[PDB]
Amino acid sequence: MRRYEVNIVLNPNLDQSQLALEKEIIQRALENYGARVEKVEELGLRRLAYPIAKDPQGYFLWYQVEMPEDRVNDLARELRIRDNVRRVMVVKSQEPFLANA
Amino acid sequence: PSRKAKVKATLGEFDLRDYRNVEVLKRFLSETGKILPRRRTGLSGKEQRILAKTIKRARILGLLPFTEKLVRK
Amino acid sequence: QYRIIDFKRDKDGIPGRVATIEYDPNRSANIALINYADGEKRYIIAPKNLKVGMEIMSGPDADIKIGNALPLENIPVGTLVHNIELKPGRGGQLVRAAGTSAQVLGKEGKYVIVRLASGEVRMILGKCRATVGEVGNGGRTDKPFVKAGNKHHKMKAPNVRGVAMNAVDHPFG
Amino acid sequence: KRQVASGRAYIHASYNNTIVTITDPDGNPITWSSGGVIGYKGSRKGTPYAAQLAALDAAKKAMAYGMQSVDVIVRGTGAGREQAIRALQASGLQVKSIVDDTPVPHNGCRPKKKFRKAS
Amino acid sequence: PITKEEKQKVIQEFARFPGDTGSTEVQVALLTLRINRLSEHLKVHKKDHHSHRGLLMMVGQRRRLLRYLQREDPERYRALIEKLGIRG
RNA sequence: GUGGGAGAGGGUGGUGGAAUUCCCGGAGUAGCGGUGAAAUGCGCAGAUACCGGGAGGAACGCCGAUGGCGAAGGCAGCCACCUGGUCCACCCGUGACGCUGAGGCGCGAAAGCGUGGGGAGCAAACCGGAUUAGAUACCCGGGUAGUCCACGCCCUAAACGAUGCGCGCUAGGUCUCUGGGUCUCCUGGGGGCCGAAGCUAACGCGUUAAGCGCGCCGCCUGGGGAGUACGGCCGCAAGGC
């Protein structure tokens, strides 16, 4: 398969039970689709550099994860789905590049 | 010319690969928040190109305002 | 053949698998006979797509699974619906054929915003309902009526016009 | 008969008249003036001088409802934008500060002949 | 897309002599593979003109190759031919 | 083959803020817009400025460049799905398999057409204003088609390098992109600048040839009429060949 990093953001105004049920659907999905999680960060929340969700802050989640090429898009939408899905961004996973070396 | 600041020698082993490099990218913002030119970045083609790509992924997921009010003036 | 059938699901949880293509002759609507849990079926609302391959439903919960329904309550903003239920459950309240349907183009309090297919915009109420996705009318327009008058074929009103009659004659004419 | 002590002053100016107006310390309007607001017809409205006459009376009134402390907003290039905003600091009036906004798009709206010739 | 391992499964399949990294057996197998997948593509995406075109030059190469073959020994030409399935 | 690589080549879907008009609330005056200077036109039913919010189509700033990719025309928010070209190292595989191409085949600006969506803004036409002698146009104020998408359909052009494609021969200096290296500079590919030779009526071209040589294609032979008339074929038509 191919791996990409998943970066998607869910609302700040989402209290507990919400963080819960929604991130939970999330995971469900990913899997359902065909993603084998590899690394889940969660820098939590931040003042986005520009109001978004009329929100000056939000909850950002990133999972280095892979899956079956083509189906990318499809799951992307599966996500965006849930309103709250403030943002849905996916990116092929190339490692790094040391400039100023 | 444009040699009073210069940005290359402000960042060591620099991975032009983690869009989430907030505080580093936040380090090419100037004020109304443009994209400070080679004329400043001390960056190559390889540079503005890749660097930019992220710059872009960056505004995308946000966390860097793609321009934003200039104080004083 | 000269009959109607359904237009409002309200016993949920019941799996509703898209039985089949029974594209239908009675209201610009192709429909599928829907197959419910119990065997209980329903020649149900066209909604373009959800393939022969029986496979959805709707309900209290949700599953914005295109096609399918629920209250506008349990409803995503930016969604195309039909099954257009205006008042708290009066069967569907619009888009029949009506391809473009209504858009949860924003919703507020016990009132939800419908870009009103037919051509304007305003709101419905709470738990009210709708099912989204497509209608199924294949352009369901044009088609020829060449050498003869498809009309007359219409069986549908060769209620022919007039309006210029040498007369005294009819209601605003 | 509103009185505030502080807020912002807005300067906007074409190259065919200028305008200036008081805004509360948020954004809602106070009182203003501009080119023809100063007996100036056709042209004139388009002079650094004007820039001033106005900027000035502007403040005066600005004072009327006890106003003095002001930060300033910038829109466009006013052919005298300076005799102007300067006139502004001169009428003392807590010449707090200025900010840069003259907000150009991002490139998505063709203009009229006069503005085309771009590329 | 065409996967390396498969590509080899290929080259291999063909080679009269397991070391035919480049011969017409492979030019052939190859080119045609590309051919099919490519077209398939073309159909949906009904308007990939640039691409189609290239594809085209390609059908071209495929051919000139076969060509040569027949030219030399239409024998394994017929052989291959059949194997692959081109011409009908 | 394989291993490295670079791009606005392509198409499919997908979001994203900048600003832009109109919509609803706030607040607040008497002006606004505008030009060579006006006026036409808007505005006390309060506009223009500013505060927020809304709806929406279009485009895509900085980075971005004398930079890049592409057969040609062309092509730049980001994102993933399928796809094309092509470049440098290994020297590994094949074994001259080749280069030109009449007809043909497809591609293919912008206008325009066909239909089915959209249509913020810009905009022949059409409307005012202004103008001068005259104003059917330069200037200002209005606004349709079209400009935008899907689909089908027209293929035109200073379609430019005004200059077919292939290889091979002939000082150099320089800048720059991209790929390899013993990485003070050499090496392959790409782009601009200056430049011997040499070509050239002339300018000017100058290993990105308008130098020297081989194949193959095309197209030339005084101006107007003229790229037209007519025959033919093409197209919804406008027209086209």
From Swiss-Prot, chain B:
GO terms for molecular function: small ribosomal subunit rRNA binding; structural constituent of ribosome. One of its GO terms (biological process) is translation. One of its GO terms (cellular component) is ribonucleoprotein complex. Transmembrane segments: none annotated. Keywords: Ribonucleoprotein, Ribosomal protein, RNA-binding, rRNA-binding. Coiled coil: none annotated. Located on the back of the platform of the 30S subunit where it stabilizes the close packing of several RNA helices of the 16S rRNA. Forms part of the Shine-Dalgarno cleft in the 70S ribosome, where it probably interacts with the Shine-Dalgarno helix. Belongs to the bacterial ribosomal protein bS18 family. Part of the 30S ribosomal subunit. Forms a tight heterodimer with protein bS6, also interacts with protein uS11. Binds to the C-terminus of IF3 and to the central section of Era. This is Small ribosomal subunit protein bS18. It comes from Thermus thermophilus (strain ATCC 27634 / DSM 579 / HB8). The chain holds residues 16 to 88 of 88 of the full protein.
Swiss-Prot record, chain C:
It comes from the Bacteria. Belongs to the universal ribosomal protein uL2 family. Part of the 50S ribosomal subunit. Forms a bridge to the 30S subunit in the 70S ribosome, contacting the 16S rRNA. May also make transient contacts with protein S6 during translation in the 70S ribosome. One of the primary rRNA binding proteins. Required for association of the 30S and 50S subunits to form the 70S ribosome, for tRNA binding and peptide bond formation. It has been suggested to have peptidyltransferase activity; this is somewhat controversial. Makes several contacts with the 16S rRNA (forming bridge B7b) in the 70S ribosome. This is Large ribosomal subunit protein uL2. The lineage of its organism: Bacteria, Thermotogati, Deinococcota, Deinococci, Thermales. The chain holds residues 61 to 234 of 276 of the full protein.
Curated annotation (Swiss-Prot), chain D:
The keyword Transport does not apply. Residues 109-119 have a biased composition (Basic residues). GO terms for molecular function: rRNA binding; structural constituent of ribosome. Keywords: Ribonucleoprotein, Ribosomal protein, RNA-binding, rRNA-binding. One of its GO terms (cellular component) is ribosome. Residues 99-119 are annotated as: Disordered. PROSITE patterns: RIBOSOMAL_S11. GO terms for biological process: translation. Part of the 30S ribosomal subunit. Interacts with proteins S7 and S18. Binds to the C-terminus of IF-3; however exactly how IF-3 interacts with the 30S subunit is unclear. May contact the C-terminus of Era. Belongs to the universal ribosomal protein uS11 family. Located on the upper part of the platform of the 30S subunit, where it bridges several disparate RNA helices of the 16S rRNA. Forms part of the Shine-Dalgarno cleft in the 70S ribosome, where it interacts both with the Shine-Dalgarno helix and mRNA. This is Small ribosomal subunit protein uS11. It comes from Thermus thermophilus (strain ATCC 27634 / DSM 579 / HB8).
Swiss-Prot record, chain E:
GO terms for cellular component: cytosolic small ribosomal subunit. One of its GO terms (molecular function) is rRNA binding. The keyword Coiled coil does not apply. One of the primary rRNA binding proteins, it binds directly to 16S rRNA where it helps nucleate assembly of the platform of the 30S subunit by binding and bridging several RNA helices of the 16S rRNA. Belongs to the universal ribosomal protein uS15 family. PANTHER family: RIBOSOMAL PROTEIN S15, BACTERIAL AND ORGANELLAR, SMALL RIBOSOMAL SUBUNIT PROTEIN US15M. This is Small ribosomal subunit protein uS15.
